Amino acid sequence: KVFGRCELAAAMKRHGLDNYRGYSLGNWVCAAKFESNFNTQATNRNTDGSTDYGILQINSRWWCNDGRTPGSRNLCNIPCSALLSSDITASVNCAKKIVSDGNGMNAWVAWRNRCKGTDVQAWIRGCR
Numbered sequence: 001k002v003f004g005r006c007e008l009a010a011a012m013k014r015h016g017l018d019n020y021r022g023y024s025l026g027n028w029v030c031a032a033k034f035e036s037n038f039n040t041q042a043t044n045r046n047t048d049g050s051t052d053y054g055i056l057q058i059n060s061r062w063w064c065n066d067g068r069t070p071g072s073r074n075l076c077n078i079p080c081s082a083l084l085s086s087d088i089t090a091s092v093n094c095a096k097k098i099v100s101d102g103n104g105m106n107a108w109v110a111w112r113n114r115c116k117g118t119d120v121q122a123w124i125r126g127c128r
């Protein structure tokens with residue numbers, strides 16, 4: 001499923017992401033845009049053999065199991081395929097654990113490079 005901008009903002013707020021760990025809703029929508037273009041089925045193979053999955057491009061090296069990342073962990077304790085669902089609950093719950101591990105949203109390189117320090121409230125402006 002490709003979410004609309006306001007539709008994802010609402011679903012993210014629905015699931016407790018707005019101001020989670022102090023990161024306003026605009027930050028998560030902005031990150032989703034540049035990670036996945038709002039597509040839950042997005043996947044991207046990394047150099048190290050790991051793979052990013054879903055709306056927030058959550059990586060198999062640490063966070064989910066795909067059975068093909070030698071020496072990886074599964075700290076969200078989910079199959080990576082659950083991160084590709086039209087229902088964003090598993091991506092949101094895993095995102096909560098990633099953003100709590102010390103680096104905040106810098107864990108998403110695309111957020112640091114493309115959302116950090118910008119006017120992220122524009123990404124929810126006009127939405128209900």
Ligand SMILES: [Cl-]
Nearest residue numbers: 024025026121
């Ligand atoms: Cl915001």
Ligand SMILES: [Cl-]
Nearest residue numbers: 067068069070
């Ligand atoms: Cl694996």
Ligand SMILES: [Cl-]
Nearest residue numbers: 021103104105
């Ligand atoms: Cl932080």
Ligand code: NA
Nearest residue numbers: 060064072073
């Ligand atoms: Na893994």
